[PDB]
Amino acid sequence: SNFLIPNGTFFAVLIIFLIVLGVISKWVVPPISKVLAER
Amino acid sequence: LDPNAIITAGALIGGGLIMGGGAIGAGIGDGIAGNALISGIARQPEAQGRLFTPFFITVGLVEAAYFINLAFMALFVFATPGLQ
Amino acid sequence: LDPNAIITAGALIGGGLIMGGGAIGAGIGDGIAGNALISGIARQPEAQGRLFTPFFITVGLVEAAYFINLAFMALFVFATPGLQ
Amino acid sequence: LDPNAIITAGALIGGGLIMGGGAIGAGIGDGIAGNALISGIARQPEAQGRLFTPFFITVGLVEAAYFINLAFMALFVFATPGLQ
Amino acid sequence: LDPNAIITAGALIGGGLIMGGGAIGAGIGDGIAGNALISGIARQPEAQGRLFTPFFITVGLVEAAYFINLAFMALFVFATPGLQ
Amino acid sequence: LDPNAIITAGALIGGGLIMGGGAIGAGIGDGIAGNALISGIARQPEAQGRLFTPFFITVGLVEAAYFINLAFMALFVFATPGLQ
Amino acid sequence: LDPNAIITAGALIGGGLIMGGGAIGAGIGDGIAGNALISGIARQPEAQGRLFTPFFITVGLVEAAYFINLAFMALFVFATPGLQ
Amino acid sequence: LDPNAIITAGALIGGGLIMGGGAIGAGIGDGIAGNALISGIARQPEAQGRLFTPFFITVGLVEAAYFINLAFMALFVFATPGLQ
Amino acid sequence: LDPNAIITAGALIGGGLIMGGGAIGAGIGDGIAGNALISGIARQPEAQGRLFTPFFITVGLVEAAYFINLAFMALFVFATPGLQ
Amino acid sequence: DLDPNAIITAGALIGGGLIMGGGAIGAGIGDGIAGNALISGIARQPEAQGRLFTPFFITVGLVEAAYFINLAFMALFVFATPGLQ
Amino acid sequence: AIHVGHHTLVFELFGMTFNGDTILATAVTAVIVIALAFYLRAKVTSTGVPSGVQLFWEALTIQMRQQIEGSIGMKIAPFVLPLSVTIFVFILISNWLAVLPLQYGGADGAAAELYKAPASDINFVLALALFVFVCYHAAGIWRRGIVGHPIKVVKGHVAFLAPINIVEELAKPISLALRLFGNIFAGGILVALIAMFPWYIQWFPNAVWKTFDLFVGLIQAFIFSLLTILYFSQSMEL
Amino acid sequence: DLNVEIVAVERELWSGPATFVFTRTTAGEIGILPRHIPLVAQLVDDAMVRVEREGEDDLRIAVDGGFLSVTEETVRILVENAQFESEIDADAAKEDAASDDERTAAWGRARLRALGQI
Amino acid sequence: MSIFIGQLIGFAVIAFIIVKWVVPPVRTLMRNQQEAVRAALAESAEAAKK
């Protein structure tokens, strides 16, 4: 149980991260910046 | 003597040293950074918030060493390299 | 010879190193943070309360490490990894 | 080579490390806090009354750790964990 | 007793020393540099921009040592030289 | 060999650690307190009478730790616990 | 058991000591030099370009010691003196 | 194996630790006290005679620990307690 | 086992201790001296040369001690005393 | 059947190594701190140079003293190992 | 028994292994983040009184925007603002979800958590750190050219320290991951270790450690995001 | 509460109770609270003084030739010249700032800092 | 199963501490932000009316 060797999970987790990034780079941050600019 | 006993005794000594050094470093660095922050606040009480950003950076960096060490400590005492 | 003897001797030495390093870190970090607190209270007595907010943070950031060390110290001397 | 002999030697070494670390940390931390207190009193002779309140706190947070170490050292030498 | 057992026990202790000392050094250096940075920012808030180029130079040096040690730690543990 | 020989060697190393750590702590803490005292007396010649009070307290703590360790050093090397 | 085993274990522990102390020295010295540099840049922003000339010397000098210690990784770990 | 061999080796290591700790404490404390003395004399030349009083006490305290350590080192090596 | 193996292992560990302590002392002392040199140069630029006379002296002292250790280390590993 | 002399010599070498490690740490740190004070004072008060050597040297004289004492005992540990046989 | 590692729901696919526990924890964190994002998007009040979700999101955006402006031109590297933000929240949630009381017993006397923070898994931290590494290295490539960027980093702030700079760069990703790893991995042990106590005394140390771990996780998320921003900035200069 | 006093070379400009006093000495930004230790510092060439009172808005002042003296009784700020927020005009704060003359530029920067736009 | 009870009591303590000390201040901060933005909007409306 080395628990330090990279596993296949490395890729999978990365994939999921990107999805979150995709939903935060397009549907969260731009609206927030627009709202702050409007204020 | 069973070789694995020697290996794991050496590993326990090694991990003890790992975390002894890590705790020394983390304690000293946290103390020094907190000293800087407390002195800055006492010297300018309203500056408090502005200091949290840099201070934590320092904390982070300091803690890095300690916690990085901690990881390898586990690697010494849970998956001992060179174990037979 | 019984391997467990070597296992527990190495574990005890490792836990001693754990706890010694933890004591070093805790003592020195608390001393430095307290030096900052004392100097600040001397400089700005009315900031006393406002100074405890950062000081404790520092103490926390220090004390946890010590207690973390303590925890692992127990892990060495009560459930020795790799024991056999 | 009695297992108990090896375990006792390891316990003694571990207790020695624990007390060495505790003494180093306690002595230096108390010295640093006392330095803060002495400088504060030298600058403001009458501030001493309000400088003991933080100073003692610091001393506590130092001595506590040291005394905690003490307890565990007594655990190592007398109630040696893992001793058979 | 096979030679490799003693070799690997010594190697694990050696690596423990390696990166325990590395962690102590990294913690001390990071704490000291961060204290400098926090004091500078507290005194000169507009200096935050110009206080990072030197700071992250010295930190860059400090961490270097530590990580170099880490590298050799691996060489001691995962590629133990002289290991029959 | 003789188990008591191993126990005595472990106890001697432990007590050496006791007093080495105690001496480091005492020396450094006393140096720090004395630096504070010297600076305070420099900046305030008449403060001497009112400075030795906190200074002693500082030293009183420091030496305490040291001498406490000394006592236990004796316990390690003169009435060795677990010395079968 | 063969003597090369004991000699190589001793060499590994010795090299761990060497460059662990080297890393402690390098980290602390570089941190202190960087503290000086950062404080100087904070107090005299224009002095930045002028402050490297002493700074690096210190760093270099400090680093020299570290690298000298690192040199004795080659002498100890790889080509062990007294190896038979 | 001769038990006297083990006991004497342990005593030699213990005395080495005794004197290492004593030397570290003495050097650090004396350096800090001298730093205070030199800074005080530089800031105010007139206090050259006034500062040497407290300074000596400081040094005294520091030196005491060292010499005490030395004494016990002799006890450890020349007349080893528990020798048999 | 070969007695020379034990002698050489002890000698290598001792030389590692010597060089580690020398590296710690030299690195930190050079760092402190360079810190004060950098501060002095930052306070005023014209002092550069005037400040190299004392700084060098200090570094000299520091380096000398370190180099002495080096010599003794060369004695330990190569001309191992009491090799028999 | 390892020679007792070998165990004594190994212990003596480790002990002396500790002696030098501690002595060098102390000497280096103390000299660095005293020198820091010296050069700070020189940077602030140039006219204090001749005045600042008398304390400085005292400091150094004390620091090195401890160091050299350690050196002496190191020799006694290595070349005249007490309990040697 | 501590059972360090021992990933649950581990499976195999395409000639490579996957840790079911880490995948599940990361997916749950992503679901929480997505739910918060859509709660914000549905209920954006450009003119009305903002709700808690909008307040939190705008506070995070303001903090990260301030960090970027202080470090590098906010109009030079806008893409850092989202990335940083998401990282923060991601890590934060991944840690805060551990505060729940999901640690049961497997009848062997050793604790087992239904949910384990993914940052205790080397794969999660490695993914985050290496993604940040490639991201800001590519940003430096764009901002300084394919040839200038490696040369600039090799030279560093002072040319004569060329070797150290190399190591420094190699230290940036690793330091980012292991640090985080440790800060969370230790927790996975402490709670497990606290399980060794009986309930009537286990309750208190567990409560104290989890309370502190809340702050530890928040601080680690903040540090990861801030160091990501700062590394981005150091790679986009001149 | 502590007594603040902004006093010019010619006429004392202001005096009264306050709860906090922020300014920028040559060493660095300093905040003074009631029982601050005795202190004597020099305000930065383009210093600004912000006096926070109780129940009233912060009073912001641009200072030329500053000197701060904190005493156990009261806090005093000495100015070769000083202008309040109301008595400062943005335009001349701009043309005066960015001028070649060192003192002119410093006075302009101090006026801008007192205004708030910096 | 005992460790489950221990963690449950610990989480009850954590929740009590939160709702006792952390929730009030953060709720007040949220209310302050809401009131600040509301006052800004009201001021804008009043400015247009003026």
Author numbering:
A (entry chain b): 22 to 60
B (entry chain L), C (entry chain T), D (entry chain S), E (entry chain M), F (entry chain R), G (entry chain N), ...: 3 to 86
J (entry chain P): 2 to 86
K (entry chain a): 10 to 247
L (entry chain H): 3 to 120
M (entry chain d): 1 to 50
Give verbatim lines from the article.
As do other ATP synthases in eubacteria, chloroplasts, and mitochondria, the enzyme couples a proton-motive force (pmf) across the IPM generated by respiration to the synthesis in the F1-domain of the enzyme of ATP from adenosine diphosphate (ADP) and phosphate by a mechanical rotary mechanism. The mycobacterial PS is made of two proteins, bδ and b′.
Substates S1a to S1e are in S1, and S3a to S3c are in S3. In S2 (where there are no resolved substates) the c-ring has traveled two c-monomers further round (ca.120°), and in state 3 substates S3a to S3c have all traveled on to approximately the same position, four c-monomers (or ca. 280°) further on. Again, the position of the PS suggests that the order of substates is either S3c > S3a > S3b or S3b > S3a > S3c. The main differences between the substates within each state are that the positions of the PS and F1 domains vary such that the F1-domain (including the α-helical coiled-coil of the γ-subunit) appears to pivot around the PS during the catalytic cycle. However, alignment of the substates via the “crown” in the F1-domain shows that they have identical nucleotide occupancies and that the position of the γ-subunit is also maintained. Alignment of the substates via the a-subunit demonstrates that the c9-rings and the membrane α-helices of the a-, b-, and bδ-subunits of the substates are in identical positions, as are the ε-subunits, and in some instances the lower part of the γ-subunit. Each nucleotide binding site in the three α-subunits and in subunit βTP is occupied by an ATP molecule with an accompanying Mg2+ ion, while the site in subunit βDP has ADP and an accompanying Mg2+ ion.
